[PDB]
Design a binder for this molecule. Structure first.
Ligand SMILES: Cc1ccc(-n2c(=O)c(-c3ccc4nn(C)cc4c3)cc3n[nH]c(C4CC4)c32)cn1
Ligand SMILES: Cc1ccc(-n2c(=O)c(-c3ccc4nn(C)cc4c3)cc3n[nH]c(C4CC4)c32)cn1
Ligand SMILES: C[S@@+](CC[C@H](N)C(=O)[O-])C[C@H]1O[C@@H](n2cnc3c(N)ncnc32)[C@H](O)[C@@H]1O
Ligand SMILES: C[S@@+](CC[C@H](N)C(=O)[O-])C[C@H]1O[C@@H](n2cnc3c(N)ncnc32)[C@H](O)[C@@H]1O
Lengths: 382, 382
């Protein structure tokens, strides 16, 4: 229909190999922060058959048992037997971690007042919010995340014991344009691929995915006779996890954020402390965007910020409201200037970013869930 | 001024550790394609002090010497001595490469007619084009790439022998809104950070970066008394490359594409053959977008496509012209349907994607350069 369009987003499960890496990187970050709130962490993880490798830079007063931290994260995910393709008890854990470069340390935080610490790198970051859901997230990505969460729930409760931890989902929604804002009309296509055991047949899996997963997550009002379902479209997914596909930290940055909506600056979140603005400034930009929507100034908004390594204040700030505010974008920038301080050394205080809650962010998206500090809107003064 | 806004993009040099990984992943892909045009390649690279690790899946009839291919790529980049922090002659090259999962192979390409091969994965991809430059790319990212290329040029020609291969640049441009299209007005801020030797002082570097790099790349009409320069803002960058920061393939996906403009689906390009739609469908979507702009239908356009693993046709196609076309987005979709076939098995033929030219794409962006097939517009019939 005229004034309508399609949009597709995807999500992945806790056992998707890239997501395994994000969760391990954040389990390492949390382990350091539990002992040293000022740990400087830049922990990349790589996963392939039988291997977790940690590579990066950590300067911290914590004493962390990497073998224990990695294996416990893999256990939580559900890879606990060679029949599943990966086992926390018996995999190889390799560590190539060095101290943070002293050249970065001197230029960013050494001998600097905390509020005046420099950005840990240059870069650009975006925040986005949309009133199409209560949580201010796109419906395409919320549904895709919930489909993966439902698969994990039915695997863990033994309802569908043939399920394995590696999964991917994708949701296409037809939207109506509404003066810059968007209104979901219907779900056009759903894809679900999930690793499974050798005994279950394709028809049993497809029936369960439709009746016990899709129907348990997606409201029936969005599904109709024309909705297309691609359930186990490859036909066979016994080999999975790192054995099926090498994973790396920071290779699901669009799943971690807005599912293609808004914009992205390229930075990965997991394995990084607050001084790395790829994470802290993106969380602050989401906080700003969500505050503008919950404050009734916008129905849909995009915020860009950027930084230079060693410099505290952002180099640029831009706001695009998609035509959904009566205030000009110059007025919105002034409101943001009066209400937020986007220096990393102030974001850490506002968003409590030395707290070890990062492993919780590393699956199912970093935004629109669980009332993390960046999800609690700031009451704006203007 | 009213109707203006700021936008920032970044780029990185050939020796940036993430970019080293993209180039090595693509050198491995090209090595396979030189002997086996139908090689199935999914090669991730990880780089840290003294180490290149290859992890992933390759099924190919080629006989490839990974030690030689990796070291030759590192040599080309310029890491040829321990004084520079990395040396192709003496680094460790580790290989954890297995065959492609037979479950993926059976679901995607085994016993399938080439035109009817399934997408190698699910996912979403975007194409973008803007008439603000002849090459139909955002000026922010074109300038950022050219600044890194200039640093490599002056390093290689011996003009600035203190330069090392690892660099990052960032450009903020103030734009004027023009009926959906954008017009660059001026450069607001430039950042340049580049690895250097122990002997050169900060003032000599900052003077050279302004006079020999910025002035040699950015037209003077964009620079004025208010332009902000952050040159070597960390103050010291002797440690660099993988020693300073662990790199991974597919961690510069926004540098590889549009610098934050348009949209991104999350997929990485390097190390993947044509059957991986993260690369082929994104190249085809750029080709569509550039064809719509060069054909005079749009001044600025975004194209989304999506796929399911094992299914040839895209699941969804969407076009947003930012208000820059007289044709409706329904009409543009019909023109695209009549002129393009976005099945991966047809994109391979149109864009010649079995040719080993991929290492050439892995630095300075995959788009807007060198008249690759996806940069030559298709003449549209309607
Ligand atoms: C990153 C991004 C995300 C979404 C879109 N997107 C859109 O935002 C609108 C839209 C929304 C609301 C509207 N209100 N009015 C009065 C006009 C509107 C147009 C239409 C549209 N079609 N395809 C796309 C993109 C997938 C290619 C679109 C654009 N860029
Ligand atoms: C991904 C993306 C990129 C750019 C923008 N972006 C824009 O596209 C326009 C714009 C361009 C042209 C226009 N013509 N007319 C009549 C109105 C226009 C508005 C203004 C604007 N301000 N901040 C941003 C984003 C950085 C936050 C903006 C939005 N999204
Ligand atoms: C298709 S793989 C990427 C391509 C792969 N590296 C190759 O060698 O072709 C990407 C993701 O798809 C999922 N996957 C793996 N095996 C699959 C299968 N047989 N069917 C469907 N999806 C699968 C996993 O979540 C995996 O991380
Ligand atoms: C700042 S590092 C990322 C943070 C780092 N992992 C850490 O431990 O803090 C990201 C990129 O910045 C660049 N870089 C490295 N050392 C730098 C320095 N001393 N000054 C400026 N940029 C530097 C390199 O291009 C590097 O890949």
């Amino acid at each position: 229909e005229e004034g309508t369009f399609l949009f597709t987003s995807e999500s992945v499960g806790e056992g998707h190999p890239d997501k395994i890496c994000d969760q391990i990187s954040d389990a390492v970050l949390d382990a350091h922060l539990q002992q040293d709130p000022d740990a400087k962490v830049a922990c990349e993880t790589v996963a392939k058959t039988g291997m977790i490798l940690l590579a990066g830079e950590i300067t911290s007063r914590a004493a962390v048992d990497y073998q224990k931290v990695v294996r416990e994260a893999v256990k939580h995910i559900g890879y606990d037997d060679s029949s599943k393709g990966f086992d926390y008890k018996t995999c190889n854990v390799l560590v190539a971690l060095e101290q943070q470069s002293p050249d970065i340390a001197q230029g960013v935080h050494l001998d600097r007042n905390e509020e005046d610490i420099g950005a840990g790198d240059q870069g650009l970051m975006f925040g986005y919010a949309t009133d199409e859901t209560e949580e201010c997230m796109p419906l395409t990505i919320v549904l895709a995340h919930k489909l993966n969460a439902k698969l994990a729930e039915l695997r863990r409760n033994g309802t569908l014991p043939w399920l394995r931890p590696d999964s991917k989902t994708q949701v296409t929604v037809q939207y109506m344009q509404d003066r810059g804002a968007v209104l979901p009309i219907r779900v056009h296509t759903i894809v679900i691929s999930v690793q499974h055991d050798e005994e279950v047949c394709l028809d049993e899996m497809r029936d369960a995915l439709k009746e016990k997963v899709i129907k348990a997550v997606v409201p029936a009002k969005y599904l109709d006779e024309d909705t297309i379902y691609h359930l186990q479209p490859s036909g066979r997914f016994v080999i999975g996890g790192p054995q099926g596909d090498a994973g790396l930290t920071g290779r699901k940055i669009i799943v971690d954020t807005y599912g293609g909506w808004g914009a992205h600056g390229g930075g990965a979140f997991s394995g990084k402390d607050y001084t790395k603005v790829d994470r802290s400034a993106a969380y602050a930009a989401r906080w700003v965007a969500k505050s503008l929507v919950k404050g009734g100034l916008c129905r849909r908004v995009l915020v860009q910020v950027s930084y230079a390594i060693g410099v505290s204040h952002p180099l640029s700030i831009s706001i695009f409201h998609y035509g959904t505010s009566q205030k000009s974008e110059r007025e919105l920038l002034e409101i943001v200037k009066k209400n937020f301080d986007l220096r990393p050394g102030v974001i850490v205080r506002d968003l409590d970013l030395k707290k070890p809650i990062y492993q919780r962010t590393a699956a199912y998206g970093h935004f629109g869930r669980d009332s993390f500090p960046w999800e609690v809107p700031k009451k704006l003064k203007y």
